[PDB]
Amino acid sequence: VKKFPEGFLWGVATASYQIEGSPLADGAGMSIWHTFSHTPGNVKNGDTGDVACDHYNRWKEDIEIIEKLGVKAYRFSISWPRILPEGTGRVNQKGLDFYNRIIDTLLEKGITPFVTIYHWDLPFALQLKGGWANREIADWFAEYSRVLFENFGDRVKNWITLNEPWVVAIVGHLYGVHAPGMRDIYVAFRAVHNLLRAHARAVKVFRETVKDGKIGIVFNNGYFEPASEKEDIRAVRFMHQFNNYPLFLNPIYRGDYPELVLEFAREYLPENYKDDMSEIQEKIDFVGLNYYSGHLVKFDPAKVSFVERDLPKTAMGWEIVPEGIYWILKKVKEEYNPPEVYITENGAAFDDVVSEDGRVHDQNRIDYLKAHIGQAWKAIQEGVPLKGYFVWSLLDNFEWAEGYSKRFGIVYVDYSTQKRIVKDSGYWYSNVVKNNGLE
């Protein structure tokens, strides 16, 4: 039996563009994920977010599912272009209405709302002005955040500025695999910097407008291990500092980028980037870590490449390494000692099938989840201030450049009918929540 602290927060997480559909409904502006996925070749099978889980219409049934499961928290994001169709200026009341109904329903049902201000669907209108490459996005992002705070901060008390800013910067602007689909290393590192400035402006606005709430920021993380006791160990140190929370938490807590990031990337950062660091250290209330996989790494003349290992993998091909989530929780306490931590995403893609009995027998997902929750429990016993854990995802959804081909939900979605079928893993997680732990 592994029981968690009294009042520990069990949740599920989604993102607006992955589940909503109806991206241009009720006066919404286009986002960069709309234009990116409507460009041939960018997304597997030409899939887009036009329909997705149709959550834009089915939101009440989805929340009734969260309730029925006994889940105590719901992490969801707001589409910036639904709220401000040109990114700044005009506010769309029907966009506010859509989220106001979700927020009120959650509160009525006693589910704690965790709102992600930005989960990758930037207004297209702002991308035309350079998007995350433009220093002015710090102002645009502050104006957007202020609207949300003024409108929803009476009810939502837990906020997240950014989801996975490393991915937004590097996968969007260096690898070109995500919107807005660019390949320019100087743009990518300017986006890193501007994401930090915008995050800090939003926190500053939060302190004036929501005097009783808490605000944090969410990072993707991998557990990197070296391919030899040899350059190899440093390559691993590099990957942690670049790919994990330190790229952002070193600025936030210590006022400069991490050592090995500066070594690799100094030339790509704005010349006087240090001028902004005083403002970047704006105090945050919590750190959200996302976590999925482990990676064997070696030096390879970013002077790093991955080595495949004969470990169990998910449908993404991500090696399953549960001790990574213990490692990243311990490491964040050890390096920056944040006052609170949340695991804001943990989950797995498996090739789910509805059996003849009408059920989805995803023991593989149960096994994955159980092992990572066990490792999180361990971190708590050893003093990590972990306040909550969020499963990615409530629903199968639009998995970015993989489209609908990858299923992460604990609830199955039949896209031909939009029917939801709770999977074995969802039933299993519900029991974990009720018992406040494992057994």
Ligand SMILES: O=C1NC[C@H](CO)[C@@H](O)[C@@H]1O
């Ligand atoms: O925030 C996220 N991180 C990784 C998930 C699985 O790839 C993704 O679906 C989600 O948007």
